[PDB]
Point group: C3
Chain length 143, copies 3
């Protein structure tokens, strides 16, 4: 598929981007001394450190939003790649998603003013919606 | 694959169904004035609106359950499609999952009496379990 | 693909492992009488049972970590299988992930001392990182 290399590049970068969030989460837990498990807290200073922290919670929300958005893209974009779309159009779909999602993480973890984060979220969803509809038509017509 | 069009139809509809939940979540946050981020709250009335809401939490639980169930289906159903199953049997697997999952969201967000939601959850898991076992046998025998 | 049977075996076992966590979660909710929904609580003893429980929360954290790690593997490992890697090397990637993830669930739900869980988490991520980089190179060179 001509679109597949671009899809695999963008998707893998987004998986790596999620791994970055996972690592940041751990770093914040250690720095802020905020653990979700007693066994963790007892290792890292005592039971008083089994507690919630706003920065940790923020990291978790960013990671969750990633899972809600990037995982569908992994599916939709893979299938879309094999439908034989216009190369440039396909690239635009993938680039809008990649840029939008990277911007989303920056806006979330960087605590940027509203509605920057929400805009990046919505924007990145648009190529996903587009791919979804295209797959729907292709699937339905092949029934 | 003869089963693949039906799989792609059901899967894409389920992705769209998850997007519907994502949009509803936002609508409920705005209507109930309940935001998870201070930057959101300050935009939408003040810091007192950085708060939890039962309806918002319900939306999040529905979306989470979707991610726990639909994402495995996206994987299992794709692989299963290429194993050359009986067309009608394959359709039944996909339809049970689709109907069960749509019913699940309705039961969750509609606050239907127990155990309606839990039944739909369990029911929809059954075709997934079936596909999983079939893939296990095929994979193992090809080792 | 020569690596594909091993990938499909390990992946399906991990999906089943996640289903086990889902079932355990339900069992713990019923045993500890801790429900997230009023409709559930009213069915199972009264409104006082709409409450949080540490064991339930632990189950949810284990399931969430699974979704953060196993879902990327489902994607990365599938693509990696088609890149024509060394059979034994591919097997090692998949086995390290499988063993690491099973150990992770045991360490989490079994409340094993730190840093056993965190080590298993980190260890299992290493083959994923490896596959991600390999896909990046292949994708980039095919642009
Ligand atoms: O939740 C936990 O178990 C801990 C924890 C432990 C390890 C973490 O990143 C590993 C990781 C994540 C992603 C990777 C991607 C590629 C390669 C290695 C990777 N490695 C994060 C949190 C925290 C709580 C106690 C101490 C920190
Ligand atoms: O969490 C947030 O960032 C906000 C928010 C912002 C946007 C939302 O839906 C976008 C969306 C979702 C799914 C889509 C699927 C297809 C096409 C467009 C799509 N667009 C939801 C919540 C809420 C908090 C502050 C205001 C609401
Ligand atoms: O959250 C809920 O809806 C309930 C609930 C209900 C059912 C559950 O496992 C089903 C399941 C899960 C995974 C499967 C995998 C294969 C085959 C059947 C499978 N079946 C768990 C929790 C709990 C709250 C009220 C009572 C328990
Ligand atoms: C893909 C991973 C991107 C990580 C984005 C990290 C954004 C760091 O941005 C930082 O955010 C802080 C608030 O959290 C601010 O105090 C700093 O001014 C800002 O530099
Ligand atoms: C795929 C998306 C399906 C959305 C299902 C929304 C269900 C709306 O159902 C509504 O639920 C309310 C309680 O929340 C009740 O007050 C109403 O009687 C009922 O109509
Ligand atoms: C793939 C699913 C694996 C489930 C792992 C369950 C681990 C059970 O392990 C149990 O944990 C208890 C604490 O929770 C301890 O009291 C027990 O000593 C221990 O046997």
């Amino acid at each position: 598929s001509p679109a597949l290399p671009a899809f695999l590049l963008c998707s893998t970068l987004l998986v790596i981007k999620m791994y970055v969030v996972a690592i940041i989460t751990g770093q914040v837990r250690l720095r802020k001394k905020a653990f979700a498990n007693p066994e963790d807290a007892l290792r890292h200073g005592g039971p008083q450190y089994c507690r919630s922290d706003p920065d940790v919670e923020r990291c978790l929300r960013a990671h969750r939003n990633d899972m809600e958005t990037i995982y569908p893209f992994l599916f939709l974009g893979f299938v879309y790649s094999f439908l034989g779309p216009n190369p440039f159009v396909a690239w635009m779909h993938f680039l809008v998603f990649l840029v939008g999602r990277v911007a989303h993480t920056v806006a979330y973890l960087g605590k940027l003013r509203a509605p920057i984060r929400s805009v990046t979220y919505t924007l990145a969803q648009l190529p996903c919606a587009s791919m979804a509809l295209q797959i729907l038509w292709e699937a339905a017509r092949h029934l």
